[PDB]
Every structure is written in structure tokens, then in C-alpha cells.
Design an enzyme around this catalytic site. Structure first.
Site, PDB file in Angstrom:
ATOM      1  N   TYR D  20       0.778  -1.245   0.000  1.00 14.06           N
ATOM      2  CA  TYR D  20       0.000   0.000   0.000  1.00 14.06           C
ATOM      3  C   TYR D  20       0.806   1.290   0.000  1.00 14.06           C
ATOM      4  O   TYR D  20       0.238   2.376  -0.029  1.00 14.06           O
ATOM      5  CB  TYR D  20      -0.973   0.020   1.191  1.00 14.06           C
ATOM      6  N   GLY D 136       0.557  19.100  18.104  1.00 16.12           N
ATOM      7  CA  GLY D 136      -0.041  18.725  16.834  1.00 16.12           C
ATOM      8  C   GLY D 136      -1.267  17.839  16.985  1.00 16.12           C
ATOM      9  O   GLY D 136      -1.684  17.174  16.033  1.00 16.12           O
ATOM     10  N   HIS D 141      -4.787  10.465  18.270  1.00 12.17           N
ATOM     11  CA  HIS D 141      -4.695   9.364  17.312  1.00 12.17           C
ATOM     12  C   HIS D 141      -4.908   8.020  18.015  1.00 12.17           C
ATOM     13  O   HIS D 141      -5.328   7.052  17.388  1.00 12.17           O
ATOM     14  CB  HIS D 141      -3.324   9.341  16.642  1.00 12.17           C
ATOM     15  N   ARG D 174      -7.160  19.149  19.620  1.00 10.77           N
ATOM     16  CA  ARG D 174      -8.064  20.087  18.989  1.00 10.77           C
ATOM     17  C   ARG D 174      -9.222  20.312  19.938  1.00 10.77           C
ATOM     18  O   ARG D 174      -9.356  19.616  20.948  1.00 10.77           O
ATOM     19  CB  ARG D 174      -8.587  19.549  17.655  1.00 10.77           C
ATOM     20  N   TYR D 193       0.953  25.416  11.792  1.00  9.72           N
ATOM     21  CA  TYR D 193       1.551  25.508  10.465  1.00  9.72           C
ATOM     22  C   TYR D 193       0.533  26.006   9.445  1.00  9.72           C
ATOM     23  O   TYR D 193      -0.614  25.558   9.433  1.00  9.72           O
ATOM     24  CB  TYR D 193       2.097  24.146  10.047  1.00  9.72           C
TER      25      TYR D 193
END
Ligand SMILES: [Ca+2]
Ligand SMILES: [Ca+2]
Lengths: 277, 285, 287, 280
Positions: D20, D136, D141, D174, D193
Site C-alpha cells: 500500500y 499537533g 490518534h 483540537r 503551520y
């Protein structure tokens, strides 16, 4: 660097079970559809009377399933025509008809495979039926692929054209307005049948409900099904535009008439529309 | 953490929507295939009726019923027939046919049920026994050898043979895999079982593990009537010698065995290479 | 409406979480495998160094770098080495090694980059050419023949050969698939390339399509160190036969070359009694 | 009646791309992580200043990624140790270090692979770092497998054990309280960024029994698309989650896009940065 399959998807072979037919989920699901063929007296009572007061003899069940509803109507002297898109489902209805084939009533019961999206060509009706029934919250099974509910419109459109002028259409759906609000499936109240660990999943895409998934559990294994969460408001206009407006809409909440504002929270909403033109 | 999410569990149906993969292209061409196979050659019919009458058979068990083609013929010729298959997708067509001919007395008496060779003993009421048990159309070869010891093959044959009454008959066939394994290609379209009014092109794949033939995968490319697509099916490449030993052993040796090559008696080493081997077994008792 | 939903797209990573299938049982056995292969036999080394010295090679291109074992040897023996591979998972071990030995002047000069045989021409700056190009360890056979006409093979070989300077050398090998295809089994554990201090059991699957061998799949069952436990991983290869490959590699040079083939490091004579586990093709480019 | 694979999942072979690695999604995703390796001046300004006022020199980046954040700290004289569980991510960080290997600062930059759930054995720190950073919105995650957020607790616990007594831990996420409410995640509303790539983001929120369980993002670019999922952490629960990681022996503090957050405040932050100063 791909994956080679033994046999093409959807292809059967004599001597071996079809693909996934003997899987763990399939087994549990078997018990589910099997331990639900027993409807509730109230439901049976509501349904039989409802169709009587309208002068309906030729009934079309467009969500036949295992034919539990249709079987009842046959036993009650109605002229039944059962249809479904799921051959796996129909297998049970057809097996029942063959067993009771000696009873003149069942010999006249018509069971055929048809899809709502092509219900027009799949089923030659001509005039129409005195009543077209779609219960058990089956319509919600049809998902929204394109995202504009075009398939929903076509489905209801064809299901409506099946109702003869002056005919009755009884279509329902769970109370998703309340499911979306509480994110859970209403209590285990025995309303449609006397039959659990149900996990409820709501998927929203850009704040718009898109799908409700249910994970049914029984004891060590489970099975899931997904539904398009129809809200009373949008569905009410959805089923009406299926006719174009030529009908007399009505809404029930667990068999009793629904009154906007009402304090009682229905588990299901049954829309009874009487086609006019 | 990667993981596949599902809208509905595998093998689960829901009223109002087509089942799992019922409308894929592969499935559609395949349906046209079984549609162009619903007919048998006169030679085949005459051979099968001849064999059955020759042994005075009346109660017949079709363990690879499929769409019923052979069962329907037997019902019409007045035998007592019980048809069984493990595939509901194919049984559907047999049941439909029986329903449409429900008024004909012989068809009202045609027994059709779901049953698996692996659990035949319990899926169907035996004990009594059938005068003849038939498993034709190279259906047995559909059963794979998952475990690698052919245990499933032995369990299936054993159960199939236990349906044969003493002195009863068992008819079971398979394509000539010795020829396919040695040339690596299925013989050019001929098939004397049915009349194929639909052109085909077969690509043959043979999988050999540690030098033992394990699987033969066939990619059937059908010429769609006015519009080319294909579907794939797999078989266990049973060879004559091994199958001969296998089916006799399923009777415990208590039987008379003979083998035909395309309806005619077979002699080892004969020049004519059959496309099908039909094993005929007469159970001792 | 059946359809597979995904948490994350295939081939996509996210910081803080292991990649796709890096910790599966198969990947873990396979890792033990490459770990027990990081060593070559004295005989292999002597043969390879001998061949390179015998043609006075200095600039070497290892096109199937892998974890870098052969490359590392060459770096240590003073050659100017450029190592390349298409697999980032394997290149990771070579890069790690170079970093740990970065203080040694020779390793600081070791070039390692990502490159695919199919686009070798642009992935790496050529033109000049290398004295010797090596593609050993039966790595070439990993490239399948998807299209069925061997066009990828021809494209890869031609790109690999174009890295060889005029008068240069190309060394490329492959297992003896003629034997595998005729016996249906890989030869019993011996492998004279490396010292396998880990027991194995190979199951061999041969796929023939219309009677033409198309693929050989090997299931390696490794004895996990303490668990007498047994797990396995699978890998496939294109079954290159001697005559075919011989024709293929020479045409990659347009016939402008001198060709010879070794059988397990020894000259090979067609019809000899000794059946080699590996065939090594050695080509001297004309110019 | 199953599916035979050519090679085992996770197994590589020399000469061919890993599984992949060359797919349509992987490509688009490549551009995404590449066109973000350019942080904002406000962010840098904030970060550098923050670490200075605390006397931090040894920094541990536990969500290393392509190393953009770490690289900045290395250039600024910090003693940096970068770590991540994703080898595909580290590849970029490692490649940058090798190219700047001649600069003394980068030669001392340590980059290793480690997983939050086993950070203790994977990384031997003993003493600890003056600062552990996880920015970040990377912690999100980590999904919740068992459904009891036990993995989250173990992850945060190990990350905290990496901070030396009197040390600093800068972790962020976030603003999901807002994303859950609006059902949308503003595409391009960054602060770390400035993205220069055109993106159309489709937001999917999945609720299991009315409890937010996962947010999925479908990033589209011009024709192709890829997706990533996140555990939607709400300020309230996260705030107690990161504190229990220490046990309470710390000085929690919350920022909203670099500026201190004031409950009630009218401004809706895009990210919440939790700066905890370990005590005991
Ligand atoms: Ca052989
Ligand atoms: Ca290798």
C-alpha cells in the site's frame, strides 16, 4: 500483490453452503428473525381492524420478510401478495406456504422477489391493491448512497403507485428523532413482539444524521444492521410527495393516534395514507 | 489501529434490500450460466434412466440437487424422489419449479430439503435407505480439502454411502482431473452432460502444494447475450485411482465397483480420454 | 448497501501509533527471520570479494540492498558503495546501521537511497555507470508478472543493466526454479548464502495458469525462540527458469555482453550431476 | 472458500514497494505531511519562549512524526530526543538528520522508535527530561479499544513518568467540545503551520450510546482522498485525565491557541494546550 479468491462473490456451488451462511453472526441473526415471528396481540388486533374499516381484501406486503405478517392476513381470509428483495428472507415465507399448501388459503398466497427501486417492472399490478403494507421498520433499511435521498424518493414513489386509487398505505419507522437525541435505542418495551444487549451507534456527517447502527448481542456473539434515521418531519413530507399530495396523511405512535406535543414518547411511528386521486 | 467497519454483519439479511452480493457482475454472468445448463442431452437422460431401471430402483436420493434438473426428470419418470443440497441459492430454483407444478400429483410428492454432506446423517431421516443415491454433475469436487488430510472427503463419502440401502446403488462422478493435471487445461468445450447454447472460454489454474495437487480454479468467461464477463469456481482435483479407493473405502469395501468414462465402460489405458468418470457402486448389504 | 468502512486509509500513518500491520504475528516471525539472516557464510563472502577484486571493481551499486548485509561487507572492504532498495521497511535496518557507525569514515560515505527497479533510471543519478552492479539473494524473483507478458521483468533488468558502466560487471542470481517446478518442493534446508541458526519448515505452493508456471509461494514455518513454538510467514516469487532468465538478462544488454552462470559459486555445466540451489549470472558488459 | 494472499501482512521483500505504500491514498497523504513541515511564526515564538522561562534544555518529543518540531528545537540548541511509534513517520525525521549530520547539533539529535503504551521499557530515561512535548493534536490518534479509556490512562501515565521532578509536560488536542457541537472540523483552521494545499474536509462523528467515540476526517485534494480517525477528547475529561497521569502532583494550566484559556471566555480556541508542571 492482491488477493486471489477461491470463488467469485455471489456464486454458489452444489454441495457446499453459500458464502457466510454458516458464520457466527449469521447464526445469532437466525435466532433473532426466528424469535420474533411471534407478534403481539395488540399489534395483530390493531392491524386486522385497521384494514377492515377501509374495505381491503387485496393486500400487498412490500417488506415480506419471513412472511409473519403476511401469514396472518392469509389466515384471516385476505387476498395476499407478498414481496421482498431478500431471497434469504423469502426462503422462510416460501417454506411456510409449502407446508400449509393443503389449506386453500395458502395455495392462493402469492410470494415473489421484488426490489422497491424497480417495483414497477418487477411486479405487474395494473389497477392496484386495496392496501400496501410496509411494517417492522423495514423502509429504514434502504441507505442513502448519493446523499440526496434520491433512492428514498424512488422507493416510496413505486411503493405508492402500487396502491389503487382510494387505497390504503401503511408504512412505519422507529422513532429516530428520539434516538438521535438520546443516542440510544428506546427501552425493551414489548410492543411489536414478545422476544438484549443492544449497542447503538449514530454516525453524523457534517452534523446531519446519516446512519444508525445496532449491535445486537446474546449469550458471546452478536450481529449488526444499519438504518437510515428518518425523522418524523422529513419522512412525513417524504411519503406525501410520493403521491404528490393526493392523499390523507395520518400518524400513529405505537398504534394510538399521535398528537404533536403529546407527552408519551412513541417507539414507532405508523403513517397511514389514504390515496385519493 | 486499522480495522474494517461493517454496515451489516456477513450473512445477515434485511427485508427490502438485495442480499450481500446478489447483484455483482460475477453473480450475474454465473446466473446466465446456470440458466444455460438447465437442459440435459438425450444421451445423458437415457443413460441415467437406463441405469436406474436396470437395477429396479424406485426410491432415489439426489444429494447434489442443485437447481433440480436431474430430480425433475426423475419425478416425471415416476420415481420416489428426495432432493437435497447445501446451497440455498440453488435450491431456490428447484423449489420454485416444484411450486409451479404443485398440481401434478407426482410433484406434490417431490421432497426437497437443505442438507450438508458433512451432516447428512442428521439433516435427513435415513435408516430405511434409498434404492439409489446420485451425486452427479461433478458436484463432489466442490468440496475442498481444508485440513489437508482429506478427512472431509472421507466424512462426506461415508455419509453419502450410508444413505444407500443394502444392495442399493450409488452413482457419483467427477471430471477427469488426471488429464487436467497433466495438461494443465480443462478439455475444449464439449461437455456431454448438457447442451451449452452459450460460448465459453475457460482459463485453468492449478495449485500444487509440496507436489500434491490441491486445487483447480476455473475462470469461466461467458459471452453475455448482446452487450464478455466471467466468474470463478474451484474444485478439488480428484484423480481416478484415488477416488476409486476413496469411494470403496466409504462402503468399508462391502460393495461392487465399476467406472464409466462418458457413459461407456472404462478400461485402464484405453486410447479414448473421457471428460467424466462415473463411479457405479452396488452395495453388498 | 454493503461496503467496507475504514478507520484510516491503507498506507497512511499517524504519529503515536504503530503503522498498518507492523505488529501482526506474521510480521513478527518474519522479523526474527531477517534477524537470523544478517550473517553470510565465509564461502559466500570469499566468492563475492574474489569476483569483485578479480575485475578490479571500485564503485558498486547494490540494487537489492535489503537490510544491507552485503553492502556493509563491501563498505568495510573499502569499496565505494551505493545501496538502494524499494522497501522502506528493510532499508530502515541499513540506515540504522550506517548511523551507528557514522564515525567511521567509510560508513559516512555509504550512500543509501530509495529506488525502484522500474524507475531506476530516474530514482538514481546514473550516466557515468558503476564498476559492478549486484542483485543477489534471489531478490529479483520478488517482482511478479502482473500483465502476464514479462514486460515488467524486461523493464527492470534493462534499468538494472543500464547502471553498469561499459566493461562493467552485473551479478544477479535466482533460486533453481527448474528443480522447484519439477519436484514441487524447495530443496531441504542448506542455503549456502547464510548460516541459519534457526530451524525452518518450508511448504511450497506452485500455481500454474494454462500450464505455464506463474507463481511459487513459500510458507516459512519458523521455530520461535522459546514459546518450541511455531509460527510462519508467506512470500511469493516468479519462478524463473534457467534458459528463460539467461535469455532475459542478455537481452537487457542488447546482447552486448559476455555471459556466464555459476551454480552455488561454482561454474555450471548444463547436464552436470550436481543440482545447484542457486544460479548466479555474471555478465561483463562490452561497452 | 476464503482468500489466499501472495504475501503475509507486514512482510517486506527486497526490490518491491511495501504493501500500500504506492496507493492513491498514500500519495495524497504524502503531500499532507509534506506541506505542513512549515510551522507558523506565532507557534515557534510561543514554544521557544515557553521552554526558556522554565529552564528546559533536555526535551523529549513523544510524537516525533516527521520531526518538524524537534528540528526546530535542535536548531535552537536544545538537547533533543525524538520518539514515535510510526516508522513511516520517523523515516522523514531520520532523513533530515542525515542530511544535516555535519552540523554538530544534529549529530547529537537522538531519534528512536517507541510506543506510548510501552514507553517505560522502550525508552530508558532514568532521570527524566526538563520537558516532554506532544503537540499537533497527536495524542488523539490513540483510539479506545476496550471502551474504558484504559489505554489512554496508560499512555498518559507513561508519558508523564518521562518528565523529571519539577519538569514540564506540554500536551495538546483540537477543540472537540466544539467539533462535537457543530459536527464539523474547520478545514485550515490551524495555528501550528500554515497549510498551502487546497483541502475539502468531510467530518464524521460516531456516537456509541450518545457518547462521542470517534471523529473521522476525509481529506480530499485535486480527485483523490485519504482518511484518519481521532478520539474526540473534551477539555473537561482530558483535563482530569492528564492530571491523574501524575496523580495530582502537578500544576495544570490551559491555553487556547497559545493564549491562556479563561472558562466562560468568548473566543473559541482551535486547540487546547495543557501545560502541566510536575511537582513531586
Ligand atoms: Ca509435480
Ligand atoms: Ca531476502
Amino acid at each position: 500483490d492482491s488477493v486471489y479468491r477461491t470463488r467469485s462473490l455471489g456464486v454458489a456451488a452444489e454441495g457446499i453452503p453459500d458464502q457466510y451462511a454458516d458464520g457466527e453472526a449469521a447464526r445469532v441473526w437466525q435466532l433473532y428473525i426466528g424469535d420474533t415471528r411471534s407478534r403481539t396481540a395488540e399489534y395483530k388486533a390493531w392491524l386486522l381492524g385497521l384494514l377492515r374499516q377501509h374495505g381491503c381484501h387485496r393486500v400487498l406486503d412490500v417488506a415480506c420478510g419471513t412472511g409473519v405478517d403476511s401469514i396472518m392476513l392469509v389466515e384471516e381470509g385476505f387476498s395476499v401478495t407478498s414481496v421482498d428483495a431478500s431471497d434469504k428472507m423469502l426462503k422462510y415465507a416460501l417454506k411456510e406456504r409449502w407446508n400449509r399448501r393443503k389449506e386453500p388459503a395458502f395455495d392462493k398466497w402469492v410470494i415473489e422477489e421484488a426490489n422497491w427501486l424497480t417495483l414497477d417492472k418487477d411486479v405487474p399490478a395494473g389497477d392496484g391493491f386495496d392496501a400496501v403494507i410496509c411494517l417492522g421498520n423495514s423502509f429504514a433499511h434502504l441507505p442513502d448512497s448519493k446523499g440526496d435521498q434520491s433512492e428514498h424518493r424512488l422507493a416510496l414513489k413505486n411503493i405508492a403507485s402500487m396502491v389503487r386509487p382510494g387505497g390504503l398505505l401503511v408504512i412505519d419507522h422507529r422513532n429516530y428523532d428520539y434516538i438521535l437525541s438520546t443516542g440510544c435505542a428506546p427501552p425493551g418495551k414489548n410492543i411489536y413482539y414478545k422476544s438484549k444487549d443492544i449497542t447503538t451507534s449514530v454516525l453524523t456527517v457534517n452534523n446531519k444524521a446519516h446512519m444508525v447502527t445496532l449491535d445486537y448481542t446474546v449469550q458471546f456473539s452478536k450481529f449488526r444492521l444499519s438504518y437510515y434515521p428518518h425523522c418524523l418531519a422529513s419522512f412525513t413530507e417524504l411519503v406525501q410527495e410520493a403521491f404528490g399530495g393526493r392523499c390523507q396523511h395520518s400518524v400513529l405512535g405505537d398504534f394510538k393516534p399521535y398528537r404533536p406535543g403529546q407527552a408519551y414518547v412513541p417507539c414507532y411511528f405508523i403513517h397511514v395514507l389514504k390515496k385519493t386521486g
